[PDB]
Amino acid sequence: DRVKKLINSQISLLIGKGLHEFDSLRDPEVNDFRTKMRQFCEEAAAHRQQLGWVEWLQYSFPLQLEPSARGNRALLVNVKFEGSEESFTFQVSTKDMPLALMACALRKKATVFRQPLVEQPEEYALQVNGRHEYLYGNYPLCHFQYICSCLHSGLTPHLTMVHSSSILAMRDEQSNPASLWSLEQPFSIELIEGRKVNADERMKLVVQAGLFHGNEMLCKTVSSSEVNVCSEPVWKQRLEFDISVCDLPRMARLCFALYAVVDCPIAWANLMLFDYKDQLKTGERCLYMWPSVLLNPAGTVRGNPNTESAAALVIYLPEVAPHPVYFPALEKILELGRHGERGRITEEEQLQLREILERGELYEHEKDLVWKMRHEVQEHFPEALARLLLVTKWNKHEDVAQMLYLLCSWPELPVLSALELLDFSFPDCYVGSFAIKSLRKLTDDELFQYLLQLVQVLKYESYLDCELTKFLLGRALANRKIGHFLFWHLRSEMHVPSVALRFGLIMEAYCRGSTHHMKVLMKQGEALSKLKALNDFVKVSSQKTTKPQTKEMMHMCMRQETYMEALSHLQSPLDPSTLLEEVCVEQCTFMDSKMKPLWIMYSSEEAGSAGNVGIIFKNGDDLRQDMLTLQMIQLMDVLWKQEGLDLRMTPYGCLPTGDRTGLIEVVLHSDTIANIQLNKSNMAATAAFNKDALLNWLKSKNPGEALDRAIEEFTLSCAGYCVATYVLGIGDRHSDNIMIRESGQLFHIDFGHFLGNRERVPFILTYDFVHVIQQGKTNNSEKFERFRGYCERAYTILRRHGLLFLHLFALMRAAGLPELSCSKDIQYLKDSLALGKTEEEALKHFRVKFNEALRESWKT
Ligand SMILES: Oc1cccc(-c2cccc([C@]34CCOC[C@H]3C4)n2)c1
Numbered sequence: 001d002r003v004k005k006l007i008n009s010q011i012s013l014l015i016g017k018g019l020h021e022f023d024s025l026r027d028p029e030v031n032d033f034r035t036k037m038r039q040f041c042e043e044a045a046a047h048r049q050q051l052g053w054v055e056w057l058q059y060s061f062p063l064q065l066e067p068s069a070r071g072n073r074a075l076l077v078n079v080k081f082e083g084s085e086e087s088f089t090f091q092v093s094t095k096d097m098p099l100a101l102m103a104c105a106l107r108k109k110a111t112v113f114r115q116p117l118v119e120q121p122e123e124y125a126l127q128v129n130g131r132h133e134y135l136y137g138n139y140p141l142c143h144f145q146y147i148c149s150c151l152h153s154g155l156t157p158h159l160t161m162v163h164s165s166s167i168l169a170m171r172d173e174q175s176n177p178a179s180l181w182s183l184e185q186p187f188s189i190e191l192i193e194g195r196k197v198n199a200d201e202r203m204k205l206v207v208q209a210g211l212f213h214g215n216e217m218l219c220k221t222v223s224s225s226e227v228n229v230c231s232e233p234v235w236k237q238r239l240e241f242d243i244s245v246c247d248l249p250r251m252a253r254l255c256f257a258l259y260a261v262v263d264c265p266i267a268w269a270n271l272m273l274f275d276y277k278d279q280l281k282t283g284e285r286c287l288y289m290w291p292s293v294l295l296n297p298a299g300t301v302r303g304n305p306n307t308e309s310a311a312a313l314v315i316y317l318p319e320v321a322p323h324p325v326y327f328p329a330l331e332k333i334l335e336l337g338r339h340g341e342r343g344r345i346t347e348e349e350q351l352q353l354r355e356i357l358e359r360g361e362l363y364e365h366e367k368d369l370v371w372k373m374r375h376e377v378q379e380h381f382p383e384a385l386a387r388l389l390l391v392t393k394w395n396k397h398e399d400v401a402q403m404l405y406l407l408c409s410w411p412e413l414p415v416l417s418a419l420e421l422l423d424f425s426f427p428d429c430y431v432g433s434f435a436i437k438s439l440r441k442l443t444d445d446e447l448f449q450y451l452l453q454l455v456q457v458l459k460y461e462s463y464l465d466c467e468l469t470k471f472l473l474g475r476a477l478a479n480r481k482i483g484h485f486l487f488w489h490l491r492s493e494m495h496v497p498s499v500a501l502r503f504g505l506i507m508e509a510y511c512r513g514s515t516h517h518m519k520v521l522m523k524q525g526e527a528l529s530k531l532k533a534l535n536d537f538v539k540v541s542s543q544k545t546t547k548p549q550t551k552e553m554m555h556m557c558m559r560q561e562t563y564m565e566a567l568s569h570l571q572s573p574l575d576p577s578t579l580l581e582e583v584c585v586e587q588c589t590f591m592d593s594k595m596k597p598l599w600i601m602y603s604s605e606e607a608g609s610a611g612n613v614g615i616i617f618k619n620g621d622d623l624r625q626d627m628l629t630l631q632m633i634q635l636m637d638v639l640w641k642q643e644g645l646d647l648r649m650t651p652y653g654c655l656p657t658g659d660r661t662g663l664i665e666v667v668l669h670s671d672t673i674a675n676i677q678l679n680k681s682n683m684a685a686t687a688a689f690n691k692d693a694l695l696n697w698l699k700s701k702n703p704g705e706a707l708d709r710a711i712e713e714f715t716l717s718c719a720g721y722c723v724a725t726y727v728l729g730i731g732d733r734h735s736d737n738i739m740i741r742e743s744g745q746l747f748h749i750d751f752g753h754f755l756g757n758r759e760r761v762p763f764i765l766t767y768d769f770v771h772v773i774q775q776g777k778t779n780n781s782e783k784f785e786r787f788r789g790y791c792e793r794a795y796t797i798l799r800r801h802g803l804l805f806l807h808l809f810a811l812m813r814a815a816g817l818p819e820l821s822c823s824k825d826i827q828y829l830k831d832s833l834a835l836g837k838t839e840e841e842a843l844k845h846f847r848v849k850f851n852e853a854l855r856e857s858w859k860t
Pocket residue numbers: 616626652654664665666667668670739749750751
């Protein structure tokens with residue numbers, strides 16, 4: 001129909017790639033992915049359109065609960081009914097549930113409307129005014145993030161009673177429209193020739209080839225003969241490997257590196273030896289190579305799409321049999337693996353085995369004992385699966401069969417264990433499928449917390465149709481907030497050729513599953529397009545005229561009908577719960593830094609004061625490492641809160657949306673330490689001593705009794721950020737990248753560098769901040785040591801979750817961030833968390849680094 005053609009054009013525009021481009025590849029793997037995932041996502045959409053009204057609230061407006069709630073005090077609340085300007089202000093308890101609040105609003109409505117009411121509180125949900133956020137379910141009001149925030153800020157919760165018929169009307173409005181093992185011969189290939197090779201004519205060309213299973217070599221690497229540098233080198237030679245065809249594991253990858261020698265790296269290319277349908281590849285392959293910025297096994301197994309300029313390697317995969325050869329089916333593997341010798345060992349060896357499995361590099365004899373005792377591992381140490389997988393001989397099909405027999409009856413593992421198993425160190429497809437099965441129990445909150453890392457893991461996948469893609473799509477189609485961030489994490493990397501195909505296909509499938517959300521996301525893309533054009537203008541103008549001039553010109557551009565329409569009434573890409581209603585042009589500006597980022601302000605009558613929100617649009621900087629740093633800080637805040645420690649952190653939004661483009665959430669009523677320390681005259685904060693400036697500023701924002709709370713907020717957040725910057729090795733910290741809220745809360749901005757990047761970043765204590773902590777007194781050991789206590793408690797909590805941080809950072813290596821590209825970068829985190837030590841030893845070490853920081857602070 002004409003509606004299908006329109007939806008196809010809308011998807012093409014949204015994802016940034018024409019769908020016709022998928023068809024043009026004439027790739028059966030692409031075609032099957034598109035068909036199967038379209039069916040899967042359309043089935044999820046059919047299920048969603050018939051959800052009950054409360055299930056539909058769970059889909060569109062998933063609950064935002066405090067970390068303590070997951071798994072007393074008087075409170076004033078303002079409640080109105082939908083489409084009525086009239087509101088009721090009443091007193092409830094923080095311990096009361098939404099149902100009691102709703103029953104109270106209904107009794108009030110019945111008295112005011114003089115009618116014995118027809119409505120039960122069970123037919124309603126409470127919307128947060130002017131936000132895509134609702135309060136519902138059997139949780140006390142203090143457990144909702146919105147109420148918890150209102151309590152901390154002192155503000156009165158403003159809620160709207162929304163009836164079930166109104167929620168159903170939303171559901172309806174948003175509907176989609178109407179045998180290998182016999183082949184003993186060594187594996188070999190013919191290296192035919194190269195095309196479009198660029199190198200120094202004085203040198204020679206060589207092709208290094210290796211067979212890998214993840215990062216691990218399946219045998220020794222082999223090199224071609226050296227042939228003189230030219231545009232079309234010709235080898236026409238056989239490269240034989242030290243591994244039988246029968247012993248190639250299912251996920252074996254053949255990896256190449258073309259280089260020049262008198263070493264000068266030129267290009268690299270990888271390919272899976274078996275296709276997506278489990279068939280062993282035969283015949284000619286033209287491999288369009290990727291430039292080398294020598295073998296790169298973690299590199300993509302798809303060819304470079306720039307076939308016009310890429311160097312190409314032509315190879316021949318020999319016909320090993322007169323008929324096609326497929327990897328054996330699971331039943332054949334299980335039959336082979338079912339047979340073995342069950343380990344019988346001494347009581348002393350059982351103690352030595354327990355010692356190593358509970359301990360991750362091992363010696364050869366330690367690996368032999370783990371393998372020998374693999375049945376004992378399964379039955380009594382199931383969480384040591386990763387250790388057993390690492391000792392398995394992936395180059396011996398009998399050993400692999402025996403490992404897979406145990407894997408297929410392995411008990412499900414905790415979420416923490418499964419995150420480790422997604423690492424590229426575990427490349428087998430059954431292992432990958434096992435990890436996904438153990439991750440199905442992830443709550444939507446945990447999935448959201450690790451979504452960024454799960455998206456990065458897609459870059460290690462060998463095939464398009466995989467369990468991780470299906471998992472992410474199914475969870476995204478069942479939770480609109482997950483769907484929102486899955487979309488943006490994929491869309492923001494469409495300018496990266498190695499992932500544009502895979503990411504483009506996932507975004508298309510998602511859109512098939514929610515036509516309405518596709519349109520919501522298109523409205524966000526239109527605002528982003530306008531912001532880029534506006535920012536390009538500001539960049540040009542800022543070099544030619546004065547700031548008030550560029551600001552008025554920026555304002556005139558925004559007041560154009562096309563800009564006013566595109567920039568208004570959208571869901572925020574930083575947070576789909578936040579609605580960006582009317583752009584407040586008068587309040588919009590830009591910042592003086594290099595990229596001239598735009599500062600965009602919004603207001604919303606319906607949301608009142610909560611509708612006053614800002615976004616910063618920045619183009620020219622890669623925001624991926626900032627987002628990762630902020631998400632790690634937010635995880636620290638969750639882990640602390642789960643132990644009842646609230647360090648008053650400010651986990652503001654940061655989201656890459658495109659090529660060196662993204663948004664940052666504005667924290668209103670905040671200023672940089674630098675601006676406050678300028679100590680300007682005729683201000684409430686003006687000081688006799690520069691050290692008095694920050695405290696005088698806090699006193700001016702918090703007069704009388706409020707000062708004590710502000711100093712406390714400052715102290716707790718200082719402790720949180722001191723521990724966060726030390727653990728993450730956040731460097732380049734000065735007064736212009738540290739901010740303070742009027743509440744007293746300190747937070748960090750502009751996370752350009754982390755993990756010591758290479759130098760070990762020491763713990764930092766600044767004397768201007770010690771002065772505030774000590775309430776302006778020269779000596780105040782009571783307050784200072786209380787602050788040290790918060791630091792120690794925060795640090796010991798993080799250490800206890802050390803493995804989670806390590807597993808997440810390990811998955812992030814797939815992102816290709818320059819400061820997270822090797823083992824040295826992660827060693828930084830291993831050292832800061834001192835995980836190879838006892839808690840008493842690590843606390844002793846932290847105390848040494850803290851005291852060293854105090855003595856450095858005392859020099860000021
Ligand atoms: O994470 C980054 C990365 C790069 C630049 C920055 C930045 C620079 C200047 C201002 C800000 C604020 C101002 C107050 O609200 C909080 C954040 C948005 N952030 C933050």
